[PDB]
């Protein structure tokens, strides 16, 4: 009975409500607010020729890779702005990219519905395609390297899959969302991960078990970005609703509401700081705000680009943050 | 200054930049078109006449055309529609004949309106094809008209209704400076490339005075 399903929903909602006391509106009020924070651009990468949709930092915290619709991948050197590599893609339609933790592999995909793996360290000194993971039906949305031989993907099929790169076959699938899935982020322990979907809800998953453990809700519209907390105990959610929220993975409830009246536009990406105090989030209004993690105060703002910030990432050491926009320019902020 | 290895790295970066710039200049010469039909429209017919995205490029009178038909994508289009924002023009197909299968005309009209009124994608010209002339012509005289559209109040056949539905489609074109071309195909004509060529040359001319606005 669907009425039994909604009865279970009602009783679990009642239990969650019974397990809530804060608010989170009077607590944390006594700490020293960070106030305004000044940020200044340091470098500008001007090699691309069209829109850029995704970028990722390396583990060394110096190299990064960016993807653009011109059909090319560039491996930049942030310290010197030197183009280490230029990779021509088979399909000019790309929507995501990822950097392997070991630094030997880089992956990218998009509307072609397949994920291509590129080997950087080759005997001949030129990059090559290692695997063409083609199991999904819809467009690729996000990719992440579990290790040197394990990659997770999310596509338009409302599903996610875990791959065995050398074998080239899916080993696990997730089929619970019932709605297009758009972004995902891996926990620091590399055991659990979360994904965002257009169904106005997000679900936590278990990598080994291959089954959902918790489903989060209470959000008005689509979700476009998610990222874990540094301690792997919480996460924040992007949206086209022009709002951000963060939930506790153990308490299972919404905590913060990052809403300002002056901004009514979609949110393209989010990220945290090394200590998690600073919340970063792109916007469709061409500038990305900076939010206090637990004060809900817009601490600062970053001018530019022209239009429109679509992807950003923070280094592992936290030293700097990079942002990208449809104007084919990358910037490093410190 | 900088060491020898850094100098070599800088030289390599300059070579990469030059190669990339040359590739971009070469690529920016061709014209990109998007084919966005609806359901059983004659998009397949047009593409054959010439599991994800499909690209087929052809050269006509030393002009390179790249055509895309995102038909396999079953996901919602409001996402990922923004990818084809910098496209020269788009192609739309309907029929004429089929208008009672459900109706089909209402669905096509609302889809056309939705795609023609977007926050972006607002200043791209549209090429509209009315394929399957013969089936529509045979359908009219035996089962006139009806039409599903009420308050028609016009001559029964034939160019009357043809131009009536045509005008109904050129309607709901709010923005200025953006033209809608049209042509009716019998599914056996061998001049669709000619009309596409004429439309694209007209569009590029319009773009030229646009810059020299004049607007």
């Amino acid at each position, epitope marked *: 009975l669907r009425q039994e399903a909604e009865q279970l929903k009602n009783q679990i909602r009642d239990a969650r409500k019974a397990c809530a006391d804060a608010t989170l509106s009077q607590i944390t009020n006594n700490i020293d607010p960070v106030g305004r924070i000044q940020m200044r651009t340091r470098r500008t990468l001007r090699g691309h020729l069209a829109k850029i949709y995704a970028m990722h930092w390396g583990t060394d915290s*110096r*190299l990064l890779v960016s993807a653009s619709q011109d059909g090319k991948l560039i491996i930049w*050197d942030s310290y010197t702005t*030197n183009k*280490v*590599h230029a990779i021509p893609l088979r399909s000019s339609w790309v929507m995501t990219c990822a950097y392997a933790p070991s630094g030997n592999y880089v992956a990218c995909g998009g509307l072609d519905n397949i994920c291509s793996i590129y080997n950087l360290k080759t*005997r*001949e*000194g*030129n990059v090559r395609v290692s695997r063409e993971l083609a199991g999904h039906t819809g467009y690729l949305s996000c990719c992440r390297f579990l290790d040197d031989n394990q990659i997770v993907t999310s596509s338009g099929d409302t599903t996610c899959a875990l791959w065995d790169i050398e074998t080239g076959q899916q080993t696990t699938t997730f089929t619970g969302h019932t709605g297009d899935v758009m972004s995902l982020s891996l926990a620091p322990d590399t055991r659990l991960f979360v994904s965002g979907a257009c169904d106005a809800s997000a679900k936590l998953w278990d990598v080994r078990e291959g089954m959902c453990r918790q489903t989060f809700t209470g959000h008005e519209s689509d979700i476009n970005a998610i990222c874990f907390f540094p301690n792997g105990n919480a996460f924040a959610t992007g949206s086209d609703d022009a709002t951000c929220r963060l939930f506790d993975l153990r308490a299972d409830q919404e905590l913060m509401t990052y809403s300002h009246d002056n901004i009514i536009c979609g949110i393209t990406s989010v990220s945290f700081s090394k200590s998690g105090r600073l919340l970063l989030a792109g916007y469709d209004d061409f500038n990305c705000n900076v939010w206090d993690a637990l004060k809900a105060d817009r601490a600062g703002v970053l001018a530019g680009h022209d239009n429109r910030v679509s992807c950003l990432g923070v280094t592992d050491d936290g030293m700097a943050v990079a942002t990208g926009s449809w104007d084919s320019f990358l910037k490093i902020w410190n | 200054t900088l*060491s*020898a*290895e*850094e*100098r*070599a*790295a800088l*030289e*390599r970066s300059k*070579a990469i930049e030059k190669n990339l710039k040359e590739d971009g200049i070469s690529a920016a010469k061709d014209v990109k078109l998007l084919l966005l039909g609806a359901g059983e429209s004659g998009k397949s017919t047009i593409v054959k006449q010439m599991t994800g995205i499909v690209e087929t490029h052809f050269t006509f009178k030393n002009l390179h055309f790249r055509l895309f038909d995102v038909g396999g994508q079953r996901s919602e289009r409001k996402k990922w529609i923004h990818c084809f924002e910098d496209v020269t023009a788009i192609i739309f197909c309907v029929a004429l004949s089929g208008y009672d299968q459900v109706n089909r005309m209402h669905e096509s009209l609302m889809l056309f309106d939705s795609i023609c009124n977007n926050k972006f994608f607002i200043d791209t010209s549209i090429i509209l094809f009315l394929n399957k002339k013969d089936l529509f012509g045979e359908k009219i005289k035996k089962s006139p008209l009806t039409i599903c559209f009420p308050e028609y109040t016009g001559p029964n056949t034939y160019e009357d209704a043809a131009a009536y539905i045509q005008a109904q489609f050129e309607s709901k074109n709010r923005s200025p400076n953006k033209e809608i071309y049209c042509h009716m195909t019998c599914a056996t004509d061998t001049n669709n490339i000619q009309v596409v060529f004429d439309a694209v040359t007209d569009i590029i001319i319009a773009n030229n005075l646009r810059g020299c606005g004049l607007y």
Partner: single-chain antibody
Framework: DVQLVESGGGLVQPGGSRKLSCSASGFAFSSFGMHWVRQAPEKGLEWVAYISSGSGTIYYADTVKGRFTISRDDPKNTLFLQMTSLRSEDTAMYYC??????????????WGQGTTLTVSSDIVMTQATSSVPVTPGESVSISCRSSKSLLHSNGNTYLYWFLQRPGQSPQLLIYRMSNLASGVPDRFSGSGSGTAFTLTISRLEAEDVGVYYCMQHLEYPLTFGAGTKLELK
């Protein structure tokens, strides 16, 4: 796979002119900068020439300047070193090396085979002694010294180590004195100060016997050190 073959050697009277050609096969030859290295008939090693990837930069040593030129043609996959006016001491064995420069590269990784030949300031490296008695299964260290400190402002200490097995072309071991070349046992370890450097070999086997060298890449011309040969006392 990757392999360089060359055949231009011969016996020419003093001041003669010849051409040297080593043909590449098994890699993107057009994307690598190539060097030439001369091994005198008795002992020793010294840098000779260098041509960049796009032939947009060429360097020479002193004795080579004005008498030899280097050229390439990417489509044919060939490297040319022009012998002209050669003097009495020019007789030696020659190798053509491959090298690519970017962040975290491994230049001088692979060497050619060699082609014989008969006829008729700069940084200085010091090593000593040229022969030290060693036996299998016991550790050993080899030291190399320079005049100017190699520590650049970037923090990269440009020092390279090579091993030449008896009767075989050398191979790279350590680059930048802190990394390890691909396909090398982990027992090797590069360490040292800004002017003095050493090695560390553990679990020595009969395959490690040979003659080693220390080289710098900080500033041209590239200068090789003396050879320290290991034996089986």
């Amino acid at each position: 796979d990757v392999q360089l073959v060359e055949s231009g050697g011969g016996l020419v009277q003093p001041g003669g002119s010849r051409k040297l050609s080593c043909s590449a096969s098994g890699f993107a030859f057009s994307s690598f900068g190539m060097h030439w290295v001369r091994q005198a008939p008795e002992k020793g090693l010294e840098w000779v020439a260098y041509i960049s990837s796009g032939s947009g930069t060429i360097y020479y040593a002193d004795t080579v300047k004005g008498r030899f030129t280097i050229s390439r043609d990417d489509p044919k996959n060939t490297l040319f070193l022009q012998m002209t006016s050669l003097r009495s001491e020019d007789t030696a064995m020659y190798y053509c090396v491959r090298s690519i420069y970017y962040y975290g590269s491994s230049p001088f990784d692979f060497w050619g085979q060699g082609t014989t030949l008969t006829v008729s300031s700069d940084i200085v490296m010091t090593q000593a002694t040229s022969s030290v008695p060693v036996t299998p299964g016991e550790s050993v260290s080899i030291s190399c010294r320079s005049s100017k400190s190699l520590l650049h402002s970037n923090g990269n200490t440009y020092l390279y180590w090579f091993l030449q097995r008896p009767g075989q072309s050398p191979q790279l071991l350590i680059y930048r004195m802190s990394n390890l070349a691909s396909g090398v046992p982990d027992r090797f370890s590069g360490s040292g100060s800004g002017t003095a450097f050493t090695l560390t070999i553990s679990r020595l086997e009969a395959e490690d016997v040979g003659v080693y060298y220390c080289m710098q890449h900080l500033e041209y011309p590239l200068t090789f050190g003396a050879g320290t040969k290991l034996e089986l006392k």
